[PDB]
Amino acid sequence: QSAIDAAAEKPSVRLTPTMMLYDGSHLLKSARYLQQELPVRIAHRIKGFRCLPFIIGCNPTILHVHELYIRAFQKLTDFPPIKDQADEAQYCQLVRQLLDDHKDVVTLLAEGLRESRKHIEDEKLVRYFLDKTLTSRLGIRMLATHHLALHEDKPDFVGIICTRLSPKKIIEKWVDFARRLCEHKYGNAPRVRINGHVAARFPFIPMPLDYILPELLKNAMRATMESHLDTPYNVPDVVITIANNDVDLIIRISDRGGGIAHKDLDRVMDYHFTTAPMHGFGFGLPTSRAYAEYLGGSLQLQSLQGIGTDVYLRLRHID
Amino acid sequence: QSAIDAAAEKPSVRLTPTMMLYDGSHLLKSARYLQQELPVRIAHRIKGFRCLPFIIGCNPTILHVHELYIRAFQKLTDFPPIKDQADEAQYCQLVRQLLDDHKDVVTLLAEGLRESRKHIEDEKLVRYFLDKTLTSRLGIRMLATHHLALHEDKPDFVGIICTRLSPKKIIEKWVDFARRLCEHKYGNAPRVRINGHVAARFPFIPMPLDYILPELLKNAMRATMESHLDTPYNVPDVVITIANNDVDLIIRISDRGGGIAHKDLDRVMDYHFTTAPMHGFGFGLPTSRAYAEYLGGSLQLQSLQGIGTDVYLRLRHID
Ligand SMILES: Nc1ncnc2c1ncn2[C@@H]1O[C@H](COP(=O)(O)OP(=O)(O)O)[C@@H](O)[C@H]1O
Ligand SMILES: Nc1ncnc2c1ncn2[C@@H]1O[C@H](COP(=O)(O)OP(=O)(O)O)[C@@H](O)[C@H]1O
Ligand SMILES: O=C(O)c1sc2cc(F)sc2c1Cl
Ligand SMILES: O=C(O)c1sc2cc(F)sc2c1Cl
Ligand SMILES: [K+]
Ligand SMILES: [K+]
Ligand SMILES: [Mg+2]
Ligand SMILES: [Mg+2]
């Protein structure tokens, strides 16, 4: 479509998490902003699918995701200008439907690429496509969820921004989730100890942490159980340190799971790479790093082969 | 001198720590090897001084070190071929004298460069000169000390190679040294806990660890005391983890000393850089990294601003 070609050239206007902390006229300004911003971001994704190597773009699962993005651009651009609160309520129902229609895009992309990637000349190309597609999708989802959340009245929240986020509380929520998955598979899970700036509270968007934290915790718990198959009733603790400063929030997850082997170290950050249904599909580590870098931070690993691994998640503060 | 020009072109023949684990005829073969190898390594250092920027090479302290290296090449090349045990005993006395004559070369280089570096166009140049000079000097010293040590009969030692090196024991020797320096300055020192592969024993050359370990321990202890000036009677422990695998030995030193600030992070590995007589002269960190890389390993830092720093020393095993 020619409409897609016009918007794929338009530059995306990035919204700062600080800018987001800005009658009902504010919901209209937000919906109108979204209606200008979303089609441009969708069009840049469509350009990405059009630029995929022919043999990969031809995959029926990859074609399905490409078609979904075209459909999202069509539905968003065909929506009439939002003049009043009634149009704004209709818009919310469309954004909510598109949020659900695209809930499994990461799963579908992994399936489509799984076999087709093995037929290409550039290994770096698929990593670039996934880093760009998944981080842009995360940005689209945060914008969409923020607008819908501006209608709710949660205490300590302005849309998706938590004004008093406690890292200890959000880590504990995901430790409980990971211990349950771990206990279901092994009958036992490593005890998690949290130290450092346990009392820290500050404005923050939980959404990225809601993806990254269960991933890293599942990895630390699985490694601990797999390295202690001979004593599953006596496994070492996972230790989490919170460090909070004016520049960034640092979360260190240290495990005693044997470390990442020297042979595997240069492949752990590749998509699809896994040494394994509790783990995933080899997307946890590369996706979490792309998300952290997209949000002005980083994801770094330090392997102590024979002992364990320290993972450092760094996320920039809201200004 | 023209003799220096001829040997500065000759390639150095690197001796593997494994090759070193090879009547009195073996001392002669070693002294004869040294007599061919040392002048070439000394000549490459002289070439380095000749290539220093004119304003830096002119410094009287830098000129003194340049002259010392010329003198070492002259004395080693003028020494007559070693035919017997008597010539070999005379050679040992010269190597021992040169080891003492050059004991302070790192101190003299730091002094000479301290002011003169501030008059140059290439910042990277001084780092390259120091990394190359200090690591080559370390290689010269290990060769010289190994030959002299082949005359001694220490149990568990073939020259300078320890056949059953315990990382826990060598770390404890340097923890005692650092706690004494720390207790003398503050009246108290952080307690050091050692965990991981505490029972590990393997062939290893202690000499590089004898430089790196007191440096990193002095840094961890100083940072802990400087960050707890309000409670000097209650400071947090320094935690050392030993990880031993077939490829390398990893030693992690974790402190609760507040971390390395974001402003200072990109300068801590520069020579002369210090935030400070117990510390040194800003050479500890860059020298330790150059030494670790020279020996097929690495020195990496992870800063948790507001909490502490984790330092990872990795050293390749003897094959
Ligand atoms: N804490 C850890 N300890 C040991 N191995 C780990 C750890 N974290 C990650 N790994 C390794 O990295 C591989 C890839 O990780 P990831 O991308 O998250 O996908 P998956 O969870 O599906 O295996 C894992 O299969 C595992 O071998
Ligand atoms: N463990 C640590 N914690 C905090 N700061 C550290 C640590 N290790 C090194 N540093 C910082 O790095 C700087 C440079 O270190 P170094 O090169 O070893 O020289 P020096 O010991 O003379 O200060 C120190 O002055 C200090 O600010
Ligand atoms: O890929 C996604 O996850 C999503 S969620 C969403 C909501 C919209 F309004 S468009 C859109 C897209 Cl394209
Ligand atoms: O710079 C040094 O530390 C040394 S020690 C030593 C022993 C020798 F035989 S030459 C020589 C040099 Cl050049
Ligand atoms: K992976
Ligand atoms: K320094
Ligand atoms: Mg995972
Ligand atoms: Mg030091």
Side-chain angles (χ1 to χ4, degrees):
Chain A
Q1 194 187 219
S2 49
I4 297 172
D5 305 350
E9 275 198 300
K10 289 181 187 164
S12 290
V13 189
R14 54 154 326 273
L15 193 53
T16 326
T18 326
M19 284 171 165
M20 285 178 158
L21 288 159
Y22 66 131
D23 183 22
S25 68
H26 55 295
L27 298 170
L28 281 185
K29 162 138 189 147
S30 191
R32 282 158 184 169
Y33 162 71
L34 232 62
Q35 208 57 320
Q36 277 297 304
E37 202 48 46
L38 289 182
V40 171
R41 303 196 177 182
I42 307 315
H44 293 154
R45 291 310 96 230
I46 297 163
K47 198 212 189 103
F49 291 113
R50 284 161 168 205
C51 294
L52 271 175
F54 182 77
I55 190 95
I56 299 169
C58 280
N59 179 266
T61 316
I62 300 294
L63 263 169
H64 180 245
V65 184
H66 189 171
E67 288 164 341
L68 255 185
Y69 274 94
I70 289 168
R71 178 188 175 253
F73 181 96
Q74 286 166 352
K75 283 182 167 254
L76 289 176
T77 56
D78 292 339
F79 200 85
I82 300 157
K83 309 179 251 63
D84 47 47
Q85 254 59 62
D87 294 328
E88 200 275 321
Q90 292 293 55
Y91 185 60
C92 286
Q93 298 173 19
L94 171 64
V95 172
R96 240 178 251 120
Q97 190 206 119
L98 297 172
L99 276 164
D100 173 78
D101 289 343
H102 293 223
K103 71 166 175 305
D104 289 327
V105 159
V106 185
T107 295
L108 292 177
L109 277 176
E111 280 166 66
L113 285 167
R114 206 188 62 249
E115 64 296 328
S116 62
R117 170 181 208 177
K118 306 161 171 171
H119 285 227
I120 226 64
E121 195 160 30
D122 201 355
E123 320 75 17
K124 319 152 207 82
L125 195 151
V126 165
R127 191 199 190 103
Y128 179 77
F129 164 75
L130 286 172
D131 285 352
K132 231 74 190 213
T133 304
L134 304 182
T135 61
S136 290
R137 174 173 180 273
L138 174 69
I140 288 164
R141 287 214 156 242
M142 285 169 69
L143 278 189
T145 305
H146 184 69
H147 180 62
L148 289 179
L150 288 171
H151 298 273
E152 317 162 17
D153 200 18
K154 286 203 279 195
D156 283 22
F157 271 98
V158 174
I160 62 170
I161 303 151
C162 184
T163 61
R164 291 181 79 248
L165 188 129
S166 163
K168 183 187 180 256
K169 289 308 148 239
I170 190 166
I171 291 165
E172 284 174 341
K173 174 178 91 200
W174 291 114
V175 156
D176 223 341
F177 168 87
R179 284 200 82 200
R180 280 182 190 104
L181 290 186
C182 188
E183 279 171 328
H184 192 251
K185 184 175 169 22
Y186 303 102
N188 192 36
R191 179 136 316 277
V192 183
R193 295 194 338 262
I194 312 183
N195 61 42
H197 297 146
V198 297
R201 285 200 170 254
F202 45 83
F204 219 71
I205 301 179
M207 188 151 180
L209 283 173
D210 284 347
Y211 177 83
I212 302 163
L213 294 177
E215 287 307 325
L216 310 180
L217 293 166
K218 270 156 41 189
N219 289 359
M221 287 194 202
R222 197 214 168 191
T224 303
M225 301 309 290
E226 293 293 340
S227 57
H228 297 79
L229 289 169
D230 311 291
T231 58
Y233 48 73
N234 191 18
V235 300
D237 297 350
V238 168
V239 184
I240 303 171
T241 303
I242 307 165
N244 185 45
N245 61 85
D246 288 345
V247 182
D248 61 354
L249 163 67
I250 311 116
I251 295 169
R252 176 186 62 204
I253 309 184
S254 295
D255 66 63
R256 289 283 176 136
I260 299 168
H262 279 107
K263 51 173 284 152
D264 298 324
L265 201 59
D266 317 306
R267 286 176 293 181
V268 289
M269 296 296 323
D270 291 347
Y271 286 95
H272 303 103
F273 182 88
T274 174
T275 63
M278 202 231 160
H279 65 98
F281 39 95
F283 267 49
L285 264 177
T287 307
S288 300
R289 171 174 261 175
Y291 284 2
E293 286 173 10
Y294 179 69
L295 301 166
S298 54
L299 184 68
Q300 290 161 21
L301 318 177
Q302 284 288 332
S303 181
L304 289 86
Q305 295 88 356
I307 292 296
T309 297
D310 280 29
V311 183
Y312 300 80
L313 173 58
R314 292 180 168 95
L315 291 169
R316 201 188 50 83
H317 274 292
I318 288 178
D319 341 73
Chain B
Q1 194 187 219
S2 49
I4 297 172
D5 305 350
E9 275 198 300
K10 289 181 187 164
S12 290
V13 189
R14 54 154 326 273
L15 193 53
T16 326
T18 326
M19 284 171 165
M20 285 178 158
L21 288 159
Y22 66 131
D23 183 22
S25 68
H26 55 295
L27 298 170
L28 281 185
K29 162 138 189 147
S30 191
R32 282 158 184 169
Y33 162 71
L34 232 62
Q35 208 57 320
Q36 277 297 304
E37 202 48 46
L38 289 182
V40 171
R41 303 196 177 182
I42 307 315
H44 293 154
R45 291 310 96 230
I46 297 163
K47 198 212 189 103
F49 291 113
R50 284 161 168 205
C51 294
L52 271 175
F54 182 77
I55 190 95
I56 299 169
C58 280
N59 179 266
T61 316
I62 300 294
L63 263 169
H64 180 245
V65 184
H66 189 171
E67 288 164 341
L68 255 185
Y69 274 94
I70 289 168
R71 178 188 175 253
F73 181 96
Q74 286 166 352
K75 283 182 167 254
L76 289 176
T77 56
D78 292 339
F79 200 85
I82 300 157
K83 309 179 251 63
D84 47 47
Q85 254 59 62
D87 294 328
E88 200 275 321
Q90 292 293 55
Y91 185 60
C92 286
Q93 298 173 19
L94 171 64
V95 172
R96 240 178 251 120
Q97 190 206 119
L98 297 172
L99 276 164
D100 173 78
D101 289 343
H102 293 223
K103 71 166 175 305
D104 289 327
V105 159
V106 185
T107 295
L108 292 177
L109 277 176
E111 280 166 66
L113 285 167
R114 206 188 62 249
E115 64 296 328
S116 62
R117 170 181 208 177
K118 306 161 171 171
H119 285 227
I120 226 64
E121 195 160 30
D122 201 355
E123 320 74 17
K124 319 152 207 82
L125 195 151
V126 165
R127 191 199 190 103
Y128 179 77
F129 164 75
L130 286 172
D131 285 352
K132 231 74 190 213
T133 304
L134 304 182
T135 61
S136 290
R137 174 173 180 273
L138 174 69
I140 288 164
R141 287 214 156 242
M142 285 169 69
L143 278 189
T145 305
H146 184 69
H147 180 62
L148 289 179
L150 288 171
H151 298 273
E152 317 162 17
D153 200 18
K154 286 203 279 195
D156 283 22
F157 271 98
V158 174
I160 62 170
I161 303 151
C162 184
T163 61
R164 291 181 79 248
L165 188 129
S166 163
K168 183 187 180 256
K169 289 308 148 239
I170 190 166
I171 291 165
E172 284 174 341
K173 174 178 91 200
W174 291 114
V175 156
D176 223 341
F177 168 87
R179 284 200 82 200
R180 280 182 190 104
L181 290 186
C182 188
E183 279 171 328
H184 192 251
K185 184 175 169 22
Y186 303 102
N188 192 36
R191 179 136 316 277
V192 183
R193 295 194 338 262
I194 312 183
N195 61 42
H197 297 146
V198 297
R201 285 200 170 254
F202 45 83
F204 219 71
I205 301 179
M207 188 151 180
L209 283 173
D210 284 347
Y211 177 83
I212 302 163
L213 294 177
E215 287 307 325
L216 310 180
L217 293 166
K218 270 156 41 189
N219 289 359
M221 287 194 202
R222 197 214 168 191
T224 303
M225 301 309 290
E226 293 293 340
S227 57
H228 297 79
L229 289 169
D230 311 291
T231 58
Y233 48 73
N234 191 18
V235 300
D237 297 350
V238 168
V239 184
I240 303 171
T241 303
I242 307 165
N244 185 45
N245 61 85
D246 288 345
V247 182
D248 61 354
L249 163 67
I250 311 116
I251 295 169
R252 176 186 62 204
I253 309 184
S254 295
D255 66 63
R256 289 283 176 136
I260 299 168
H262 279 107
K263 51 173 284 152
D264 298 324
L265 201 59
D266 317 306
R267 286 176 293 181
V268 289
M269 296 296 323
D270 291 347
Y271 286 95
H272 303 103
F273 182 88
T274 174
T275 63
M278 202 231 160
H279 65 98
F281 39 95
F283 267 49
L285 264 177
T287 307
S288 300
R289 171 174 261 175
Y291 284 2
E293 286 173 10
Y294 179 69
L295 301 166
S298 54
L299 184 68
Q300 290 161 21
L301 318 177
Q302 284 288 332
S303 181
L304 289 86
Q305 295 88 356
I307 292 296
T309 297
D310 280 29
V311 183
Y312 300 80
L313 173 58
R314 292 180 168 95
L315 291 169
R316 201 188 50 83
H317 274 292
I318 288 178
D319 341 73

